[PDB]
Amino acid sequence: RAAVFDLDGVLALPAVFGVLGRTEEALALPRGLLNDAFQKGGPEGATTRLMKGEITLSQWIPLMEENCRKCSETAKVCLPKNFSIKEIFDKAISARKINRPMLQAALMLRKKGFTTAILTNTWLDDRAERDGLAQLMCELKMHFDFLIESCQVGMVKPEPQIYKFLLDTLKASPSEVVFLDDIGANLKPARDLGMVTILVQDTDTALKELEKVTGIQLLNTPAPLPTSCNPSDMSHGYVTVKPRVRLHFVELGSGPAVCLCHGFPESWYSWRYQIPALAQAGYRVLAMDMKGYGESSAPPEIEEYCMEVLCKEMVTFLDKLGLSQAVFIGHDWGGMLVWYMALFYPERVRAVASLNTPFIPANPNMSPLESIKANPVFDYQLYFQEPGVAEAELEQNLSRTFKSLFRASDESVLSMHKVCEAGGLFVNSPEEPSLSRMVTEEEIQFYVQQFKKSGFRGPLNWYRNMERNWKWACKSLGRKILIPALMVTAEKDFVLVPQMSQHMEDWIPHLKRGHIEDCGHWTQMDKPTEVNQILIKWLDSDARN
Amino acid sequence: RAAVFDLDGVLALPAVFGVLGRTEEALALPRGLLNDAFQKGGPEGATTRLMKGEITLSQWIPLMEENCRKCSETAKVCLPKNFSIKEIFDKAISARKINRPMLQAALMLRKKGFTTAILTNTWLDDRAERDGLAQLMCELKMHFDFLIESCQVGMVKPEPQIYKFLLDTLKASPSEVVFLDDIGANLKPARDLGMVTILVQDTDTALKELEKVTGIQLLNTPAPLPTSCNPSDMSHGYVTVKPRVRLHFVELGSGPAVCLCHGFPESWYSWRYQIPALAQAGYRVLAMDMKGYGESSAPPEIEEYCMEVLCKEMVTFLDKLGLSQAVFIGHDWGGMLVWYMALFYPERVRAVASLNTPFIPANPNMSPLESIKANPVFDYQLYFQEPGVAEAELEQNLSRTFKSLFRASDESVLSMHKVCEAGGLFVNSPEEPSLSRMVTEEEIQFYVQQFKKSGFRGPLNWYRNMERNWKWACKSLGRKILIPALMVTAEKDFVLVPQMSQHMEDWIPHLKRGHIEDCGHWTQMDKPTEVNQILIKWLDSDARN
């Protein structure tokens, strides 16, 4: 089964075709005059040539300028001194947006096994503002299995040839697919060839007919999750910052650089929902694979994981990447690394942002080891001190480990209070936890194959530099974070709760704040929508500048 | 032996310190009033604290504001309503540039084995315009083995502690190093500790003393070559565009995306001189490792190397990278791929640029095979047709092959005219060619280890799609390149000479042009300075926009 959507008028908001009407009324010009010059000599038409990619857009514009000296001429009329078919067409273009509900449907059908695709008559945009269309094209193109373009296949919508073509590339028979257009003309062929057809008068009904003809709920359906990241379609980057330390990241998007530092014990994958989203927002995302995790080198020494070297290494990463700075957004430990980054390398930090992790100054008087036994929640933080031990029960059964950790506040199957005495973090938990409702079985077998590499020693050593991380931290007792910084708290996070971050103003005067109720500790995978909403809003005004 | 240069006043142009003088004269304020408030309570001084990184710049500004209510107060004076120590300091900062001749010296000494480094009193720039300094810091930082910063080591210039420190990290004794400062105070310590010292009054003499004390020619020395790329300090990127086709590129710089498509039979390394340079120019360079070369997949099928699939693959590369478009700059074949890119995917091409390779329309009447036997120079183009053959003598001895090809116009050891009949391209050449004067023995053993991977079949298949590349090329006989495009020709190129490109205007109306006389076929490594000069000038006004 399949589904083909025309771009204009089905996935594109104000279907360009319409403008020659709109425009016409505005200048009060002879009804239909325009959408008449747009279609001269049927096939010999300038428009059709453009359709077939024989001429560039910039070429066709003038041939359409002319008709508008012949189309208005025969109907005994006249036109304004500077009649911009160019200007009128830019606006129309820049004006079309995505038909969100429609895209939502094509996404669903794919989701429930449908080879979706776009069949569309299109020109070869060589305009000076081509990038805008090319930009939207990307957003859409991305969610479809195929994207057939007239100017690319030298065939145009009506010709039954393109259909046989589309039907070919679609490895399917007419009777297995639907076809939605806003043009009767192009539709007959589908129907006169087999495939179910739907005239897209109004979206609301189109989908009404669609969900109908498919027995799949497409309309007024639950607000979906942002786009996740397929680890195979990602651009994987590498940088060797030191002799035995290579760093892996994932790159997507262009524009201001946004470095994402995940937490413990995750990967660059933890941001699966904010990577496509932020990239789309107008940023260049670099989803860090922190030191010790997955594809990044994972040396044994406990010391190689203190914030000081972790931070000198992040700069080194910027350096070898040719970046003056970047906006570091962090989580869990990633959040701590970030606070220090803004505390020791302001120049290099355009904007600071942490999720859950609070900027807490260091207590020169009480050593962290002490000052941490001074908190119930932080009991597992003890059980992590003896190299070898924690590695053990964690590296014991990767699947079990992640299905146990990556659990919502309520879903829990652990209780980090009294663990050492408990003799393990999984002591009283099922050796086969039920799947969390935040993650699919696949998303888990992914963190499984990742940790199969360097294990849990590298990750467990971040917890093993208390004394060091504290000492270096005192050097910055006089400092003050005056760069754009955001502190985002989660209601149901139990180990890193909102309260801890309440005094962050005394150190960060202009600290903005975000909060997310009914939100666990794995912020990214639990409340992606909010997270993206909150970080994009902040990025537009506090970072980008 | 070693060399340490202070940043300000030695590597930085208008040594900031000076401004408190400049500024003072302007507002006609009591001589020395400023450079007096800049230094209150010796060590307890706000300035010193900043030096030691105890306070951020944004913090110190106000403590310096004040002094200027006490420094002018005791000398019974007054100051203007809005006396911006802030504004005065931004300008001074943004104003300092690199002391090119000085950097040139530190570069030489390293070049002739010298562990060079920067010892400098510096603050922690958290200003709102910090990025500018951080930006220059990068340009410099990059050319020095070490970069000691006061605010990072909690030690400041005068304290003999920092010296013992610098001398420590420098794994050397005072008597083996020189130290150049613009401040006597900080210098005594070096001298009173051993190391040769030089007060940098005027650069001209400093170096005069320097080249002296080193017996190394540092002044009025030959204009050097732009920065080359060390393949180990590069950020290596990967993208799988197809099932069995992964693509490797090198990334450096931020800003507009600039894709570099090398030629035959080179690598991403061919742009070694334009990568650091362009990155520095304000661009994000993606030095492509073309299909079939080095780190990119290299499948056998001759067909997988026609322009059509090579181009659909480049877009796919853009897509998975989150780029709406990019500026494709190409060379040799890389130049051809680019012309087609702008001919079939305008939207995706921000700017077109080719070096040596001319945009030549396709002759529908005469088949390329014919129309190419119709040219002497293109005789080796025949010898490349039979799969297996060319691979052979080329893969025979990698070193010999590249030392023979990568030779200037005059250096030549080949003669591509009459080769098939000659029975090989190396038939009458030394089996141990002398090194070209354009490349070091290392730069060659690099292309050697690269071709050790997929060999010369992938590269030789680009030449094996004449009929196809031509047919697809006819579809675009009506087209017209109206996007920003540059055509750069080389005087001594013999196979792809300037003349071929003379009619490029009829197809590219606004085609700009560059030429480089006394320039071979390996444009990039032969005339890097010009190349960078010509492409950066064009990029600023034709692409960036």
Ligand SMILES: CCc1cc(-c2cccnc2)nn1-c1ccc(NC(=O)c2cccnc2)cc1
């Ligand atoms: C066994 C570890 C664990 C289980 C669960 C869990 C399980 C089931 C249900 N819900 C939650 N959450 N966590 C966890 C991980 C990292 C941190 N972060 C830090 O310890 C930390 C420390 C210092 C700075 N930043 C972060 C805090 C808590």
Ligand SMILES: CCc1cc(-c2cccnc2)nn1-c1ccc(NC(=O)c2cccnc2)cc1
């Ligand atoms: C054996 C090959 C060779 C030797 C020398 C050489 C040797 C010694 C001294 N000087 C020069 N130059 N070339 C060479 C390589 C690629 C091309 N490009 C193309 O053939 C081409 C074809 C079609 C489109 N674009 C480029 C043209 C010429």
